[PDB]
Each structure stands twice: as C-alpha cells, then as structure tokens.
C-alpha cells in the first residue's frame, strides 16, 4: 500500500500491537520522526520499505526516496493537526500555531498534547498541504507539551 | 519489526475541534534533535 495518506507506525516486540508513531505516505515517500523508528526497516503488507533520508538533528527519516513535503507554515493563518492517537481515530485539531525562537529562526510550534505513539502526525495547511509533523517539541511550566512543526528540506 | 497501516486521508475539516494556545517561546536544539528551553 503505496496511496498517499497518513499511516500509523506499529510493533509488536511488545505486548499485543502498539503504535510507536505516525507518518505520511506521499509521492511513494514515507515520512516520519526520526525517534519513531530510528532508522529501521518498515513492513507495508507484503513489501519492505527502506530507509532512504535520515538526520537525528531534525528528527526526521524518509523511506523510499527523498523528503518530499515542503509546504511550510505562512506565519499567519490557524493549522490543523491531524492527530492520530494510538487505538483512536484521526482526528483534525485546529490552532494557531506558536513560534520556537532559535538562535538560527523562528519555527512555528502547536500547543497541542497527544500520547507518544501520536509522534509523527501532519500538521497541514487550509489548502490541505504537509506543513509538518508532530512529536518534537519542549515542555514548559504548565507541565504540558509545545511541539516544533517540524518540516524537512 | 516495525508494520505500518493506513489510518486516512490527509484533508483539512471545517467542522474541527479548536484549542491550545500561540506560546512564545526561546529555544535551543541540540546536536541530539532535543529542544530545551533557553
Ligand atoms: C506520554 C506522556 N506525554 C509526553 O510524553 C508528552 N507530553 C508531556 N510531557 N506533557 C507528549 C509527547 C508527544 C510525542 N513526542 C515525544 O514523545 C517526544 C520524543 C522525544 C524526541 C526528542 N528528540 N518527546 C518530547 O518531545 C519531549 C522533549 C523534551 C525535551 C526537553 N529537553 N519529551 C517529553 O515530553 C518527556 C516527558 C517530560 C515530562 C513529563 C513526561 C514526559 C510524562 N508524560 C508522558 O510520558
């Protein structure tokens, strides 16, 4: 299963079946977050997918060929992650993104907390585009989770 | 082994749920792909 898409990420070298993460099937390229599967081969029904594009520092990993998501956050305007919780629904979760200031730029961030297996949802754009994926970001005061919109080149 | 399976469509709702707030916030990433709080 190659169709364009968001996917969850699954093992079982644990107990029963247990979402390790989420990605995006687009242009015949997987993309996830690099803490998800830290590099490792990926089972699609019959066929094997392969690591092709990986880099610990982004956090991000494609299979099959290059990162092909480049839509990137206007600054302006609300996002929807399409959060995908381990055993649950997708579901789309509206805000208007934050802003990670770094010494190198600033990042659009969504104040959004969703279980660890959430790791790699999409974050889109109104036009429907990859903005980014969720599942690396800081905690702050609260005590809750601020994660970057994470997009590759 | 890791298996992964299809879970939807990658589509904006209108009718979706609205929440969380626009922090801004000083951050570092370090050579791991952590941030930390500057
Ligand atoms: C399951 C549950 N919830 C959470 O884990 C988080 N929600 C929250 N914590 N409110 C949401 C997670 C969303 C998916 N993303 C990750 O899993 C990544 C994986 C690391 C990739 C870093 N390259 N982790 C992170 O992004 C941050 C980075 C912090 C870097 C600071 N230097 N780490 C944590 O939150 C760990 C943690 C801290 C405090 C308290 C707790 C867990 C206790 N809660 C929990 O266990």
């Known amino acids: ?153 | 082994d890791m298996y992964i399976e299809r879970a939807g469509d990658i589509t904006w709702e209108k009718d979706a749920e609205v929440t969380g707030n626009s922090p801004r916030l000083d951050v570092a990433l370090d050579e791991s792909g952590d941030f930390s709080l500057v």
């Open chain 1, 1 to 153: 299963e190659t169709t364009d898409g968001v996917y969850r990420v699954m093992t079982r070298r644990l107990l029963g079946s247990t979402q390790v993460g989420v990605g995006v099937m687009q242009e015949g390229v997987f993309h996830t977050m690099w803490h998800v599967t830290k590099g490792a081969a990926l089972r699609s029904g019959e066929g094997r997918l392969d690591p092709y594009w990986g880099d610990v520092k982004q956090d991000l990993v494609s299979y099959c060929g290059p990162w092909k998501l480049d839509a990137a956050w206007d600054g302006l305007s609300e996002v929807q992650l399409l959060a995908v919780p381990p055993g649950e629904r997708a579901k789309n979760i509206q805000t208007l993104p934050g802003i990670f200031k770094t010494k190198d730029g600033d990042i659009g961030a969504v104040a959004l907390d969703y279980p660890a297996g959430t790791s790699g949802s999409p974050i889109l754009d109104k036009c429907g585009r990859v903005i980014g994926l969720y599942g690396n970001g800081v905690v702050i005061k609260n005590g809750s989770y601020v994660s970057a919109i994470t997009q590759g080149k």
